[PDB]
Design a protein around this ligand. Structure first.
Ligand SMILES: Nc1ncnc2c1ncn2[C@@H]1O[C@H](COP(=O)(O)O)[C@@H](O)[C@H]1O
Ligand SMILES: Nc1ncnc2c1ncn2[C@@H]1O[C@H](COP(=O)(O)O)[C@@H](O)[C@H]1O
Lengths: 159, 158
């Protein structure tokens, strides 16, 4: 089936790869030409242009991934998606806590802060390196995550 | 003692917090104007005098959590050259930077956007109606291989 990846930097390529593994066709949008694979559909331009999303089959796609590094444009897309393609589901890259609150305020709950999960994991590797069993090191990580994300939403919930 | 966190932006604070949860004392180094937080020194983390002040002599672990990839490697070398008893975890910006850590024998690193991207794509898969078990198994296999094959090809770096 059909997925639109807006932004194809370090973030969007990982997601792109992950999903093609299960055999989802992709339509990629990115600033600036590189070189590119057949076997996908690629348009160069501002992802926050409606004409361009429509060309990536935004009309009939199932999911839109927002994987660009510019946080204002990212929100600008979320709105166009709502305004014009309400049948489109949206996952989104959030830069930091503040950006994540803004997604929440527009009712986007499926996002991920870009450096958070790697930082948590670096800190799990840290804890093991100080001689904590991987089970306790990883349990520490989970409880830390769960709460941080929980409490991030809780406060968002009181707009 | 305990742990030296070099760089205290978004990356270093998460790690800082995680570890202080278990009660590890921290010495933080950062370039730039902070708001109040353990033991904090403002300056270039890639200065030896400054690491020494963060107790680099007697610390156990050094976390490299800064956004500048050249400085990051510059520290790794000083750590090797002068504090070989110091273990090192490190933030890598991208695949190319990860290859460079590897070339200096640093294997304990993490690409900054990688694990979040993988997870965004797991959330993607669930949203298209794949059970969280298969969605998450897809993620693992994807990771395991990517990191595996990264270590493989580090050897042909230019
Ligand atoms: N408005 C936009 N439309 C399309 N691509 C963008 C836009 N803003 C940023 N990008 C790209 O998004 C990617 C994010 O890069 P990275 O941090 O490497 O994932 C980069 O390739 C940028 O050039
Ligand atoms: N050479 C350096 N010495 C100390 N801190 C640094 C250096 N280079 C970057 N930083 C810090 O790295 C952090 C990057 O923020 P973030 O990308 O949120 O982790 C910032 O807090 C910077 O002040």
């Amino acid at each position: 089936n059909s997925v639109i990846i807006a932004g194809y930097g370090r973030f969007g390529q990982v997601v792109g790869r992950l999903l093609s593994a299960q055999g989802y066709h992709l339509s990629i949008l990115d600033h600036s030409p590189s070189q590119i694979d057949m076997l996908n559909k690629v348009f160069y331009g501002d992802a926050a242009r409606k004409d361009l999303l429509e060309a990536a089959g935004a009309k009939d796609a199932q999911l839109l991934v927002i994987a660009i590094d510019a946080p204002d444009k990212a929100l600008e897309i979320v709105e166009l998606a709502h305004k014009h393609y309400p049948q489109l589901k949206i996952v989104a890259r959030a830069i930091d806590r503040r950006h994540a609150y803004q997604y929440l305020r527009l009712g986007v709950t499926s996002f991920k802060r870009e450096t958070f999960d790697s930082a948590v994991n670096l800190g799990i590797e840290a804890l093991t390196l100080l001689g904590n069993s991987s089970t306790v090191a990883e349990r520490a990580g989970d409880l830390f995550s769960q709460h941080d994300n929980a409490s991030l939403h809780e406060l968002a919930a009181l707009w």
